[PDB]
Amino acid sequence: LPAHLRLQPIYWSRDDVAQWLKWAENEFSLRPIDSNTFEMNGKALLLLTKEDFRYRSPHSGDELYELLQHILAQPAAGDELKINAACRKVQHMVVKAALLADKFPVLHDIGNPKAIKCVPQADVEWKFYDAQPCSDKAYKIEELFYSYATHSDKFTDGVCLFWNCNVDRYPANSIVCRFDKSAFVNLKQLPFFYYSDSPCESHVPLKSATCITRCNLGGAVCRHHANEYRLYLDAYNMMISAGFSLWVYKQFDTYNLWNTF
Ligand SMILES: Nc1ncnc2c1ncn2[C@@H]1O[C@H](C[C@@H](N)CC[C@H](N)C(=O)O)[C@@H](O)[C@H]1O
Ligand SMILES: [Zn+2]
């Protein structure tokens, strides 16, 4: 199965659906159907009835409908290396943007046992904490088990980072990634965005209010950022499809990112 088809169908693009048709034709020895037989994305495909499937493909619609129900009942397992890599791409993006937007002087990285900075080039004092630091990095990690009930009065300067570190309740000055609600009362959900400050370069147009780049100030995204935006969205979808969600301090404002230009 192609990588995108390992995502929940709600995330499949119009192109992913046509590759699903092609994969199923060979896996199940079906009569070839025209690639434009289901000209829609996965969100739309999930709204069709079985009768609609049968009308659009008299020779295989019912099989395809039932195949989709099986895919929907038993989601395909994901590849840890790809998922891990997708998460780390999102972590760098989000934390970089937060530091640029709000200029925190300190970052308190809670649950980081390897003392690795996800944004090594930011102008910020990086502090690491973990309940069980890796023995080869404990010399620069504070041994600490975070609980809101014990530490809510601490780490009040700068921002706190809880990247997949499940604690009882997150403090208000936090950036959080959680794997699957009272823990999040101090925060808000982080909606998708893409931010980049790399140089624009030319050589399908991208229309998106969430592409925060200099070239999108005027609505004419360059080829380079269009490509990087699509690659980033694929990584984001892989992480969200796998059960991760992102939460952020309530003052996080994407207009602070636009103002960097
Ligand atoms: N309440 C806690 N306080 C501090 N560290 C914790 C706590 N609970 C779990 N940990 C540590 O958090 C880490 C969780 C891991 N999933 C690693 C998360 C890490 N931020 C990452 O991006 O990979 C482990 O290293 C735990 O030792
Ligand atoms: Zn650009």
Swiss-Prot record:
Plays a role in viral RNA synthesis through two distinct activities. The N7-guanine methyltransferase activity plays a role in the formation of the cap structure GpppA-RNA. The proofreading exoribonuclease reduces the sensitivity of the virus to RNA mutagens during replication. This activity acts on both ssRNA and dsRNA in a 3'-5' direction. This is Guanine-N7 methyltransferase nsp14. It comes from the Viruses. Interacts (via N-terminus) with DDX1. Interacts with nsp10. S-adenosyl-L-methionine binds at D109, I110, G111, N112, P113, K114, A115. Zn(2+) 16 binds at C200, C215, C222, H225. Residues 78-261 form the N7-MTase domain. It comes from Severe acute respiratory syndrome coronavirus 2. It catalyses: a 5'-end (5'-triphosphoguanosine)-ribonucleoside in mRNA + S-adenosyl-L-methionine = a 5'-end (N(7)-methyl 5'-triphosphoguanosine)-ribonucleoside in mRNA + S-adenosyl-L-homocysteine. The gene is rep. Inhibited by Remdesivir antiviral drug (GS-5734). It is found in: Host cytoplasm; Host endoplasmic reticulum.
